[PDB]
Amino acid sequence: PTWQELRQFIESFIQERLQGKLDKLQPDEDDKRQTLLATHRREAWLADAARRVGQLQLVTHTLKPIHPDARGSNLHSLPQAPGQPGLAGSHELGDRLVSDVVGNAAALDVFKFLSLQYQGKNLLNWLTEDSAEALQALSDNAEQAREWRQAFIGITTVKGAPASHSLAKQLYFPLPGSGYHLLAPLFPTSLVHHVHALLREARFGDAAKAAREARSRQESWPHGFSEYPNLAIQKFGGTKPQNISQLNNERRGENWLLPSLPPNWQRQNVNAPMRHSSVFEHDFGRTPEVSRLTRTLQRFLAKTVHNNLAIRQRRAQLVAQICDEALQYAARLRELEPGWSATPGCQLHDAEQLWLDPLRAQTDETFLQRRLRGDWPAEVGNRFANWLNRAVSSDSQILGSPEAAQWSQELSKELTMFKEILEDERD
Template sequence: MTKCDNKGYIMTDPAITEFLAERKTEWLKKKLRRVTNKTDIDALLQYSEVLFSFAQWLPRAAVRAGQISLSTHPCTFTHPCARQNSMNTGGVTGNNIATAVIAQAKQENDGFLRSGNIQTEPDALGNAAALDIYRFLMLKMQDNRTLLTHIDEESSLAKSLLSHGDYSVLRKGFLQVNTGKKSAVTSSKIKQVYFPVFDNIAGDNYHLLSVLTPSGILFELRRRIEFIRRSAGDKIEKDKCKDSKRRFESFRTIDGITIIRFGGSKPQNISVFNNDNAGKACLLLSVPPGFKCQEIKNSVC
């Protein structure tokens, strides 16, 4: 539930005020690094209060929201420049932005590791300088829903927050992150697969599929692997401190893991999730099992 103060005004969720306070602290840390004059320090402190107030920060953030796009399968994992499309699409020549895909798969007990069966937040790609807007919109409110969900559903919390400016303009600006295009646009830099299908009317036909990476699943895999490894490491260290005669406790571990990197020295140019994981993802060993041939000895009569 949304709290109200004594005058009946809706109060902002603590996660929002904490987010802006952290941003203000980071900004002041950079600005005050070489400032020693007390007058200048006081001026910067006063200016920061205005700069990171709702009335000033929200309108700028709503404009910057158009520089990023939510996506469950960012095309930049296939190629860093895949978002900028140089092909002719719908009669428009070049420089079209590839469609940011958001998979809407439902959860089913079908035994498959796929989108919908693994619950993750959508990733985001776009201007690396605007990725803080993604973190702002993905803040979890006290009801465990994201701020973006509140804005989309026009909840009382969202109306209270966006009332610090032009409500309709701010709402439209923030919702730019998940506004889909009417027609899908791909890129020549993304792997293309011709998948045959049969149509009763058209006969033999095909779908042109663009193979994309489910970044949420990719980094959820890494998170679970690291959890298993940490748990195994903790148990081994614990057993070392015990009597050496005592048997080790059982633990799980995974061998044969390869680390793959995305984005090189600039993981933020790929996506938010990639930046959060320093551009590193895990690949499990995928080879046929090996069997040793048993020696066959002929029986001697």
């Protein structure tokens, strides 16, 4: 409201900076105190700040995370909210926006001179309006106030020509009718800082650590937690993260990338089940994916029926995943030897061996090539269905009610699909 309290606050700020640099320098002689107070104690420091606001730039998307010998145009722009559904971005950052600072590592003090809360609001939004308390609290003269306001508000607007350096990325995009756009991307350091802050609360917050301790104590808690596995660290500054930006000095490197990985990103090995009796209960069932699927079926089998059919839809989808993995198992059985099924052995699951090794029809001209064609083995999934019958809960309440009927119906449908898949293996 009053200009006098803003003047008192900025004089207190420059006095705090003066006593801080006096304590840091610790000078007792050589006239260092007079030279320190001759440039950071009066309005001329604000004039000195006029030499510092033109060097700094307040941005939300910068180019300096891309190769640091590139000099482009870092721009502060909030992207428009897309009309298409189901996709995010930096447009989702509304009032939860932190604006990055780029420039010298010594002018950055004036950033807090643009980020104080004197009247209860940020001073950049105070200087974007022609307020009555504005242009009098910092300058007695009108024209000095106007040029100081223009220089102090120019930290948001992009300086120089619109430019992207050669070391920056530029990627052509095909237009629908006969065109291209060059589309240079910038690093969303505000969005990355927001995601890194959310991950900090998720992994090292007090409530998250309390929920982790409650999980470790196996007790109840009013809220849950998360883990965020397989995170990747991408440090931008090698030894000087302050040279990248101020937000990259807050989080020193550590881009904290999310694991967008395919399910076969941790392919262990391919193994041939030689001296074993059944593939589904001894080798295929011990893989961790179908292990989590079978524990999920065990959890979903003994449950209430209030969301039943919807849960059953999920259950149907769940059971589909398991037979998918069975095909996936057969898929990596295409990566093995052509004739592993013809090796000697007392028990090697010969009922499943017509589907386990499809390439032995190349090995044997008529000993076993015509056997898979004439037999058309599709009953093996029924054996797998028997293994899937070990994935259900041993509850008599499901058998008494129609839950077992729905389970048998979706099981019959999915193994009908599995048997139809296994039928046309000869093509």
